[PDB]
């Protein structure tokens, strides 16, 4: 509690200078270190931990708005092309083209036995949609089966990502702001830690 307030202030003092940037995004990702060979941190949770997180959120947030989308992402020259998906899971039309620029990244200290937490602030700038002419297979692709639960200023994202045949499970929390420059405050960052720590320690 007392230390949670300190890290919330440390996060805010580092992110404060960036809130004037348009298209800024803030996220807290569950994950773990040294779970695949060539990577340091991997933003994934186990299959059964994903499921236990799901029912927790389904029960404690059953009153909240819930969306559900299947999309097909293509990484190409640093840009991410998002495609809509048909009944078979296959790409149709390109809906958005965005470029992600990491601004600030912080590792959150976590209780022993809980999932690691990664706090990231970045810009996701939309781009010229004519670049969809490259098609949905010009680069590495990820099929994303996302369940989003929006609760106030927080959006929980639970995603099954099929990539090169293997299916991974991802859990993250995003900020839902009308104006992040005015609404992302210390007390918001303190709550983000509270809610992320709850998911990370569900065992």
Ligand X SMILES: CCCn1cnc2c1c(=O)n(C)c(=O)n2C
Residues lying near ligand X in the complex (CB under 6 A): 76-79, 97, 127-128, 131
Nearer residue to ligand X within complex by CB, 84 or 197? 84
Please state, in angstroms and as integers, the Cα–Cα distance from residue 94 to each residue in 23, 67, 159, 163, 186, following that order.
20, 19, 20, 19, 37
Q: Cβ 142 to ligand X, closest distance in Å?
A: 16
Looking at the Cβ atoms of 23 and 41, the one nearer to ligand X is 23
- Position closest to ligand X via CB: 127
Sequence ranges of the binding site for Mn(2+) = 25, 27, 172, 174
The β-bridge relationship of strands 24-33 and 79-85 is: unpaired
Calpha distance 193→127 (Å, rounded) = 32
**CA dihedral for 4, 107, 139, 97, sign (positive or negative):** positive
- Residue 83 or 119 having the CB closest to ligand X: 83
Nearest distance from C-beta of residue 74 to ligand X, angstroms: 9
Cα gap 52→25, rounded to integer Å: 27
CB of 201 to ligand X, least distance (A): 39
Q: Which is nearer to ligand X, 61 or 134 (CB)?
A: 134
Pairing of strands 154-163, 166-175: antiparallel
Question: Closest distance between ligand X and the C-beta of residue 22, in Å?
Answer: 16
> What phi and psi, each to the nearest 5 degrees, are found at residue 13?
-65, -25
């Amino acid at each position: 509690d007392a230390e949670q307030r300190a890290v919330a202030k440390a996060l805010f003092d580092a992110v404060n200078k960036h809130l004037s940037n348009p298209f800024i995004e803030v996220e807290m990702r569950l994950g773990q270190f040294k779970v695949e060979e060539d990577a340091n941190f991997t933003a994934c949770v186990s299959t059964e931990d994903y499921e236990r997180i799901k029912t927790y959120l389904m029960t404690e947030m059953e009153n909240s708005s819930m969306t559900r989308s299947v999309t097909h992402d293509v990484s190409l020259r640093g840009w991410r092309h998002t495609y809509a998906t048909d009944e078979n899971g296959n790409p149709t039309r390109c809906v958005s083209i965005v470029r992600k620029k990491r601004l600030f990244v912080k590792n959150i200290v976590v209780p022993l036995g809980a999932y690691n937490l990664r706090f990231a602030v970045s810009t996701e700038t939309p781009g010229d949609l004519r670049f969809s002419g490259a098609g949905p297979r010009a680069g590495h692709t990820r099929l994303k089966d996302r369940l989003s639960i929006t609760d106030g200023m927080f959006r929980y994202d639970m995603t099954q990502v099929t990539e090169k045949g293997v299916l991974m499970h991802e859990v993250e929390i995003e900020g839902v702001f009308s104006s992040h420059e005015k609404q992302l405050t210390e007390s918001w960052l303190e709550e983000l830690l509270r809610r992320a720590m709850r998911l990370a320690t569900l065992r």
